Design an enzyme around this catalytic site. Structure first.
Site, PDB file in Angstrom:
ATOM      1  CD  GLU A  26      -1.251  -2.292   2.323  1.00  0.00           C
ATOM      2  OE1 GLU A  26       0.002  -2.499   2.305  1.00  0.00           O
ATOM      3  OE2 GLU A  26      -2.081  -2.942   3.071  1.00  0.00           O
ATOM      4  CG  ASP A  82     -21.691  10.408 -10.140  1.00  0.00           C
ATOM      5  OD1 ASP A  82     -20.925  11.135  -9.463  1.00  0.00           O
ATOM      6  OD2 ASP A  82     -22.297   9.400  -9.717  1.00  0.00           O
ATOM      7  CB  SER A 135     -20.062   4.940  -5.829  1.00  0.00           C
ATOM      8  OG  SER A 135     -21.409   4.566  -5.924  1.00  0.00           O
ATOM      9  N   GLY A 136     -17.586   5.165  -7.896  1.00  0.00           N
ATOM     10  CA  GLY A 136     -16.323   5.825  -8.197  1.00  0.00           C
ATOM     11  C   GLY A 136     -15.298   4.936  -8.826  1.00  0.00           C
TER      12      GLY A 136
HETATM   13  C1  LIG Z   1     -22.157   3.418  -5.072  1.00  0.00           C
HETATM   14  O1  LIG Z   1     -21.483   3.207  -4.079  1.00  0.00           O
HETATM   15  C2  LIG Z   1     -23.624   3.721  -5.148  1.00  0.00           C
HETATM   16  C3  LIG Z   1     -24.557   2.738  -4.871  1.00  0.00           C
HETATM   17  C4  LIG Z   1     -25.912   3.023  -4.928  1.00  0.00           C
HETATM   18  C5  LIG Z   1     -26.376   4.224  -5.428  1.00  0.00           C
HETATM   19  C6  LIG Z   1     -25.479   5.263  -5.658  1.00  0.00           C
HETATM   20  C7  LIG Z   1     -25.939   6.601  -6.187  1.00  0.00           C
HETATM   21  C8  LIG Z   1     -24.123   4.974  -5.576  1.00  0.00           C
HETATM   22 CA   LIG Z   2      -4.293  -3.607   3.104  1.00  0.00          CA
END
Ligand SMILES: *C(=O)c1cccc(C)c1
Ligand SMILES: [Ca+2]
Length: 240
Positions: A69, A93, A188-189
Protein backbone atom coordinates in the site's frame (compact mmCIF):
# COMPACT_ATOMS: atom_id res chain seq x y z
CA UNK A 1 -19.77 -6.07 -5.47
CA UNK A 2 -22.58 -8.62 -5.18
CA UNK A 3 -21.85 -12.04 -6.68
CA UNK A 4 -18.15 -11.36 -7.14
CA UNK A 5 -15.00 -13.40 -6.73
CA UNK A 6 -11.80 -12.30 -5.01
CA UNK A 7 -9.48 -10.55 -7.47
CA UNK A 8 -5.89 -11.66 -7.80
CA UNK A 9 -3.81 -8.91 -6.08
CA UNK A 10 -2.07 -7.86 -9.34
CA UNK A 11 -5.12 -8.01 -11.69
CA UNK A 12 -6.41 -4.42 -11.38
CA UNK A 13 -3.45 -2.23 -10.34
CA UNK A 14 -5.25 1.05 -11.21
CA UNK A 15 -7.99 0.43 -8.60
CA UNK A 16 -7.80 2.72 -5.56
CA UNK A 17 -9.66 2.92 -2.24
CA UNK A 18 -11.01 6.39 -1.46
CA UNK A 19 -11.26 6.77 2.31
CA UNK A 20 -12.41 9.46 4.72
CA UNK A 21 -11.22 10.24 8.22
CA UNK A 22 -13.60 8.97 10.95
CA UNK A 23 -12.34 9.92 14.49
CA UNK A 24 -8.77 8.38 14.73
CA UNK A 25 -9.44 5.88 11.92
CA UNK A 26 -10.05 5.86 8.11
CA UNK A 27 -13.15 4.35 6.44
CA UNK A 28 -13.42 3.17 2.85
CA UNK A 29 -16.21 5.01 1.07
CA UNK A 30 -15.64 4.66 -2.69
CA UNK A 31 -13.42 3.36 -5.43
CA UNK A 32 -11.43 5.23 -8.02
CA UNK A 33 -8.96 4.77 -10.86
CA UNK A 34 -5.39 6.04 -10.79
CA UNK A 35 -4.99 7.92 -14.13
CA UNK A 36 -1.74 9.85 -13.46
CA UNK A 37 0.83 9.31 -10.71
CA UNK A 38 -0.85 12.29 -8.95
CA UNK A 39 -4.48 12.08 -10.26
CA UNK A 40 -7.42 9.80 -9.47
CA UNK A 41 -10.72 9.59 -11.35
CA UNK A 42 -13.79 8.91 -9.21
CA UNK A 43 -17.51 9.73 -9.04
CA UNK A 44 -18.58 13.29 -8.14
CA UNK A 45 -21.14 11.95 -5.69
CA UNK A 46 -18.31 10.29 -3.68
CA UNK A 47 -16.83 13.70 -2.77
CA UNK A 48 -20.13 15.58 -2.12
CA UNK A 49 -19.45 15.45 1.65
CA UNK A 50 -17.07 18.02 3.26
CA UNK A 51 -14.80 15.20 4.55
CA UNK A 52 -11.05 14.70 4.79
CA UNK A 53 -10.13 12.17 2.03
CA UNK A 54 -7.12 10.00 1.32
CA UNK A 55 -6.36 7.55 -1.48
CA UNK A 56 -4.83 4.12 -1.00
CA UNK A 57 -3.04 2.57 -4.00
CA UNK A 58 -1.67 -0.98 -3.90
CA UNK A 59 -4.59 -1.95 -1.64
CA UNK A 60 -5.98 -5.51 -1.62
CA UNK A 61 -7.36 -6.15 1.88
CA UNK A 62 -8.89 -3.09 3.58
CA UNK A 63 -8.42 -4.82 7.00
CA UNK A 64 -4.85 -6.33 6.72
CA UNK A 65 -1.35 -5.25 5.76
CA UNK A 66 -0.73 -6.24 2.16
CA UNK A 67 2.88 -4.99 2.14
CA UNK A 68 2.11 -3.01 -1.06
CA UNK A 69 0.00 0.00 0.00
CA UNK A 70 0.84 3.66 -0.47
CA UNK A 71 -1.35 6.19 1.42
CA UNK A 72 -1.66 9.69 0.01
CA UNK A 73 -3.71 12.78 0.87
CA UNK A 74 -6.12 14.46 -1.56
CA UNK A 75 -4.84 18.04 -2.31
CA UNK A 76 -7.54 19.25 -4.78
CA UNK A 77 -10.99 18.01 -5.80
CA UNK A 78 -12.32 19.03 -9.25
CA UNK A 79 -15.94 17.93 -9.74
CA UNK A 80 -17.51 18.20 -13.19
CA UNK A 81 -19.10 21.66 -13.25
CA UNK A 82 -22.50 20.33 -14.50
CA UNK A 83 -22.77 17.79 -11.59
CA UNK A 84 -25.88 18.16 -9.43
CA UNK A 85 -26.04 16.00 -6.25
CA UNK A 86 -29.91 16.18 -6.28
CA UNK A 87 -29.95 14.67 -9.90
CA UNK A 88 -27.60 11.64 -10.32
CA UNK A 89 -29.78 10.62 -13.37
CA UNK A 90 -28.69 13.85 -15.14
CA UNK A 91 -25.14 12.44 -15.34
CA UNK A 92 -21.84 14.27 -14.98
CA UNK A 93 -21.02 11.92 -12.07
CA UNK A 94 -17.22 12.32 -12.34
CA UNK A 95 -14.51 14.05 -10.35
CA UNK A 96 -10.73 14.28 -10.48
CA UNK A 97 -8.58 14.20 -7.32
CA UNK A 98 -5.09 15.69 -7.36
CA UNK A 99 -2.93 13.72 -4.87
CA UNK A 100 -0.55 15.50 -2.43
CA UNK A 101 2.37 13.29 -3.67
CA UNK A 102 2.99 11.27 -6.83
CA UNK A 103 2.70 7.54 -6.17
CA UNK A 104 5.37 5.01 -7.23
CA UNK A 105 4.31 2.52 -9.97
CA UNK A 106 4.88 -1.27 -9.70
CA UNK A 107 2.87 -4.48 -10.37
CA UNK A 108 0.33 -3.29 -7.74
CA UNK A 109 0.14 0.38 -8.78
CA UNK A 110 -0.39 1.33 -12.46
CA UNK A 111 -2.24 3.94 -14.45
CA UNK A 112 -5.63 2.98 -15.80
CA UNK A 113 -5.92 3.05 -19.58
CA UNK A 114 -8.89 5.11 -20.79
CA UNK A 115 -10.76 4.56 -24.04
CA UNK A 116 -10.45 6.83 -27.09
CA UNK A 117 -13.02 9.68 -26.99
CA UNK A 118 -16.47 8.70 -28.26
CA UNK A 119 -15.93 4.91 -28.01
CA UNK A 120 -19.17 2.94 -27.42
CA UNK A 121 -19.07 -0.78 -26.67
CA UNK A 122 -21.20 -3.29 -28.57
CA UNK A 123 -24.07 -4.76 -26.58
CA UNK A 124 -22.96 -7.64 -24.32
CA UNK A 125 -19.28 -6.62 -24.29
CA UNK A 126 -17.16 -8.38 -21.67
CA UNK A 127 -16.37 -6.24 -18.61
CA UNK A 128 -15.52 -6.64 -14.94
CA UNK A 129 -16.57 -4.32 -12.10
CA UNK A 130 -14.10 -4.20 -9.21
CA UNK A 131 -14.41 -2.85 -5.69
CA UNK A 132 -14.75 -3.30 -1.95
CA UNK A 133 -18.44 -2.39 -1.86
CA UNK A 134 -21.21 -4.31 -0.14
CA UNK A 135 -21.40 -8.00 -0.99
CA UNK A 136 -25.18 -8.10 -0.58
CA UNK A 137 -27.91 -5.45 -0.72
CA UNK A 138 -27.94 -3.86 2.76
CA UNK A 139 -24.85 -5.96 3.62
CA UNK A 140 -21.29 -5.00 4.47
CA UNK A 141 -18.12 -4.03 2.65
CA UNK A 142 -15.80 -6.71 1.33
CA UNK A 143 -12.42 -7.13 3.04
CA UNK A 144 -10.65 -8.21 -0.17
CA UNK A 145 -11.03 -6.60 -3.59
CA UNK A 146 -13.87 -8.27 -5.51
CA UNK A 147 -14.52 -8.56 -9.24
CA UNK A 148 -17.72 -9.51 -11.05
CA UNK A 149 -18.26 -10.22 -14.75
CA UNK A 150 -20.89 -7.67 -15.95
CA UNK A 151 -21.50 -7.63 -19.71
CA UNK A 152 -22.59 -4.26 -21.14
CA UNK A 153 -26.25 -3.47 -21.87
CA UNK A 154 -26.35 -0.94 -24.73
CA UNK A 155 -28.20 2.39 -24.49
CA UNK A 156 -31.21 1.22 -26.58
CA UNK A 157 -31.90 -1.71 -24.20
CA UNK A 158 -30.81 0.02 -20.96
CA UNK A 159 -33.03 3.07 -21.62
CA UNK A 160 -36.09 0.85 -22.54
CA UNK A 161 -39.09 0.82 -20.18
CA UNK A 162 -38.40 -2.68 -18.65
CA UNK A 163 -34.83 -1.53 -17.77
CA UNK A 164 -33.97 2.02 -16.62
CA UNK A 165 -36.08 4.12 -19.04
CA UNK A 166 -35.19 7.86 -19.26
CA UNK A 167 -33.13 7.54 -16.00
CA UNK A 168 -30.17 6.40 -18.17
CA UNK A 169 -28.49 8.79 -20.60
CA UNK A 170 -26.09 8.16 -23.49
CA UNK A 171 -23.35 9.67 -21.25
CA UNK A 172 -23.61 6.46 -19.17
CA UNK A 173 -22.67 2.80 -19.61
CA UNK A 174 -24.91 0.06 -18.23
CA UNK A 175 -23.55 -3.39 -17.33
CA UNK A 176 -24.97 -6.52 -15.75
CA UNK A 177 -28.60 -6.65 -14.68
CA UNK A 178 -28.71 -10.50 -14.32
CA UNK A 179 -30.12 -10.33 -10.72
CA UNK A 180 -27.02 -12.08 -9.26
CA UNK A 181 -23.99 -9.85 -9.96
CA UNK A 182 -23.77 -6.08 -9.54
CA UNK A 183 -22.07 -3.11 -8.07
CA UNK A 184 -23.25 -1.98 -4.63
CA UNK A 185 -22.69 0.79 -2.12
CA UNK A 186 -18.95 1.37 -1.66
CA UNK A 187 -18.16 0.46 -5.31
CA UNK A 188 -19.17 3.95 -6.55
CA UNK A 189 -16.32 5.83 -8.20
CA UNK A 190 -14.46 2.66 -9.15
CA UNK A 191 -13.78 1.23 -12.58
CA UNK A 192 -15.64 -0.87 -15.09
CA UNK A 193 -12.82 -2.62 -17.00
CA UNK A 194 -13.71 -3.79 -20.49
CA UNK A 195 -11.63 -5.99 -22.76
CA UNK A 196 -11.22 -4.31 -26.20
CA UNK A 197 -8.66 -5.34 -28.90
CA UNK A 198 -6.91 -7.54 -26.29
CA UNK A 199 -6.42 -4.80 -23.68
CA UNK A 200 -8.54 -3.85 -20.64
CA UNK A 201 -9.54 -0.18 -20.50
CA UNK A 202 -11.60 1.69 -17.88
CA UNK A 203 -14.85 2.47 -19.73
CA UNK A 204 -16.97 3.29 -16.66
CA UNK A 205 -16.96 5.06 -13.31
CA UNK A 206 -19.50 3.34 -11.05
CA UNK A 207 -22.39 5.78 -10.46
CA UNK A 208 -25.61 4.11 -9.23
CA UNK A 209 -27.80 1.06 -8.75
CA UNK A 210 -31.56 0.81 -8.13
CA UNK A 211 -33.12 2.13 -4.92
CA UNK A 212 -34.78 -1.36 -4.75
CA UNK A 213 -31.43 -3.14 -4.39
CA UNK A 214 -27.98 -3.76 -5.85
CA UNK A 215 -28.53 -6.98 -7.85
CA UNK A 216 -31.99 -6.36 -9.37
CA UNK A 217 -32.90 -8.08 -12.64
CA UNK A 218 -33.08 -5.53 -15.54
CA UNK A 219 -31.53 -2.79 -13.32
CA UNK A 220 -27.94 -3.09 -14.52
CA UNK A 221 -25.26 -1.16 -12.66
CA UNK A 222 -24.92 2.34 -14.18
CA UNK A 223 -21.56 3.96 -14.80
CA UNK A 224 -20.42 7.33 -16.08
CA UNK A 225 -19.15 6.71 -19.64
CA UNK A 226 -15.44 7.66 -19.45
CA UNK A 227 -15.18 8.07 -23.26
CA UNK A 228 -17.64 11.00 -23.06
CA UNK A 229 -15.25 12.91 -20.74
CA UNK A 230 -11.78 12.54 -22.30
CA UNK A 231 -11.56 16.22 -23.29
CA UNK A 232 -12.80 17.33 -19.81
CA UNK A 233 -10.26 15.06 -18.04
CA UNK A 234 -7.37 16.30 -20.23
CA UNK A 235 -8.43 19.96 -19.74
CA UNK A 236 -8.53 19.57 -15.92
CA UNK A 237 -5.12 17.86 -15.71
CA UNK A 238 -3.58 20.46 -18.10
CA UNK A 239 -4.99 23.44 -16.01
CA UNK A 240 -4.06 22.03 -12.49
C1 LIG B 1 -22.16 3.42 -5.07
O1 LIG B 1 -21.48 3.21 -4.08
C2 LIG B 1 -23.62 3.72 -5.15
C3 LIG B 1 -24.56 2.74 -4.87
C4 LIG B 1 -25.91 3.02 -4.93
C5 LIG B 1 -26.38 4.22 -5.43
C6 LIG B 1 -25.48 5.26 -5.66
C7 LIG B 1 -25.94 6.60 -6.19
C8 LIG B 1 -24.12 4.97 -5.58
CA1 LIG C 1 -4.29 -3.61 3.10
Amino acid sequence: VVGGTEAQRNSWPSQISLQYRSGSSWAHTCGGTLIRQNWVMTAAHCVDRELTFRVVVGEHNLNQNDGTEQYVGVQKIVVHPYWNTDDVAAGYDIALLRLAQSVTLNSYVQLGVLPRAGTILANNSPCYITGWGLTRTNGQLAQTLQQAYLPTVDYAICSSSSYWGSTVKNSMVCAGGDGVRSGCQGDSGGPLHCLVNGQYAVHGVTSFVSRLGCNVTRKPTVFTRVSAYISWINNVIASN
